[PDB]
Amino acid sequence: NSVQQQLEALEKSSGGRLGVALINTADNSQILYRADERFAMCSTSKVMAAAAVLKQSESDKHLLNQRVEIKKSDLVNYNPIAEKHVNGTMTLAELGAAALQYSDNTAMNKLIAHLGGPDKVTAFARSLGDETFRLDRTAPTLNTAIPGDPRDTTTPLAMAQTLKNLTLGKALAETQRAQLVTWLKGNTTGSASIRAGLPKSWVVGDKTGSGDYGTTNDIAVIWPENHAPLVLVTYFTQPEQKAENRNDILAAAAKIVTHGF
Numbered sequence: 571n572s573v574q575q576q577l578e579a580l581e582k583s584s585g586g587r588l589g590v591a592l593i594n595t596a597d598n599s600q601i602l603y604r605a606d607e608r609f610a611m612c613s614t615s616k617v618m619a620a621a622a623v624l625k626q627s628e629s630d631k632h633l634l635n636q637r638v639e640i641k642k643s644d645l646v647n648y649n650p651i652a653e654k655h656v657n658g659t660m661t662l663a664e665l666g667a668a669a670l671q672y673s674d675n676t677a678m679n680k681l682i683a684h685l686g687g688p689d690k691v692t693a694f695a696r697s698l699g700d701e702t703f704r705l706d707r708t709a710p711t712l713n714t715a716i717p718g719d720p721r722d723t724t725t726p727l728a729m730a731q732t733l734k735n736l737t738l739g740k741a742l743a744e745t746q747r748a749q750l751v752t753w754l755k756g757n758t759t760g761s762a763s764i765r766a767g768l769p770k771s772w773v774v775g776d777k778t779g780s781g782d783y784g785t786t787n788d789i790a791v792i793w794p795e796n797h798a799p800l801v802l803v804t805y806f807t808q809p810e811q812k813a814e815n816r817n818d819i820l821a822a823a824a825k826i827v828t829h830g831f
């Protein structure tokens with residue numbers, strides 16, 4: 571079976587819908603599966619919000635250290651870092667780190683509020699040439715992941731292209747690019763997702779997402795030991811609202827598409 575056959579078979583066995591885009595930066599080749607179809611991003615959208623703040627910081631040397639007050643009323647469904655800082659402050663940099671490395675939903679909301687709302691995140695994506703990304707809601711409602719709902723969606727290929735631009739390319743100034751990469755590499759939430767399908771010693775930066783409809787996502791940049799980087803988006807969603815999330819499917823997809831590399 572070819573790689574395409576392998577992916578189709580994975581989806582068939584999955585009980586849902588799998589979206590994969592891998593970009594091999596060695597030769598600009600791609601491994602694409604439903605890559606122009608829309609999926610709910612869930613918390614993978616946090617990369618775009620953090621990057622939008624990094625872009626602003628290029629032209630404001632005080633931005634990343636700007637204090638943001640954290641209140642009990644800011645707490646939502648999942649906020650392991652922000653809850654430690656109630657009655658105190660976190661900087662915008664600390665909010666970026668918490669959003670990306672712990673998937674702190676309060677931190678995401680502070681980034682969105684700072685930027686001026688979800689539509690400002692969409693505008694930032696558009697500024698990078700991403701015609702597909704849209705952010706419509708704050709956390710946690712951006713994770714409803716209802717089949718066919720266009721809110722808070724993108725396609726695997728659009729997200730792979732933009733993640734490449736953000737981390738390895740044309741989107742950010744060098745210090746800010748490096749900061750985004752540092753954040754992604756230090757993610758704590760991705761052990762069982764793309765990372766689990768790769769050689770243990772490969773360096774990886776990623777951002778996960780999980781939502782309703784068993785929606786289970788991960789977006790990654792991967793640095794092999796002897797090869798150019800790979801950029802990989804694995805999105806997965808299921809037909810029933812209360813389906814279990816399935817990080818194992820993402821690991822399995824990663825293993826399939828990184829074979830040989």
Ligand SMILES: *C(=O)[C@@H](NC(=O)/C(=N\OC)c1csc(N)n1)[C@@H]1N=C(C(=O)O)C(=C)CS1
Pocket residue numbers: 612613614647648672673674675710711713714759777778779780781782815
């Ligand atoms: C991002 O995806 C976000 N997900 C949620 O807050 C969830 N629902 O909001 C309606 C959700 C659905 S299933 C589940 N576990 N959480 C955060 N993302 C993750 C992640 O896996 O990246 C988390 C660690 C914290 S919650």
